[PDB]
Amino acid sequence: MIREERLLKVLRAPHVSEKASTAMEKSNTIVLKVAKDATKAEIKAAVQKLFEVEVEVVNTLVVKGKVKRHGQRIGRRSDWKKAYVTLKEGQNL
Amino acid sequence: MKRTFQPSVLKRNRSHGFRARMATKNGRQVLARRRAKGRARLTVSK
């Protein structure tokens, strides 16, 4: 299997947004900020172990950080991976 | 009119990329000079 110490690091935060909310109440899908190097296999095992729910499928995408400007200097936010985790029909959170 | 710079990241990396510079001893001296000058960008890259 996958070591739990690894599983306890891949999930970072639950993404909260309008699209994330409707995806939760229309398709039973949660949206999570995951680790940059997390695979679909790791995300699936981590959600099933930590949240104790059954996972159907995981879709992932990498978000590119924006180039912002602090005062007079330009910076760039970090890239992060977003995961669309689909649960089975009879599961809640 | 067709100007001189027609960009192509493939040709840009094969001609001036890091591994192209490290291939010959003259390219390695280019990297040495740029490190000595303190350049923030040694070669062309993303």
Binding site: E4, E5, L8, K9, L11, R12, A13, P14, K33, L50 | -
Partner: protein
Amino acid sequence: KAKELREKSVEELNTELLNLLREQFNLRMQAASGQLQQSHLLKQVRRDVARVKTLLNEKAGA
């Protein structure tokens, strides 16, 4: 800390390591949701994880 931890076996520290990691994971979810007022707890649990892994790496050599 770092003195009661040295009085434990290698297998006991591993259990303590997982407890901290689970504790650290719970804090991230609370902090993300905005329900964590005691933000100082994040640095604490992160530091004692370093303490545990330090001893495990030490007891491995001896």
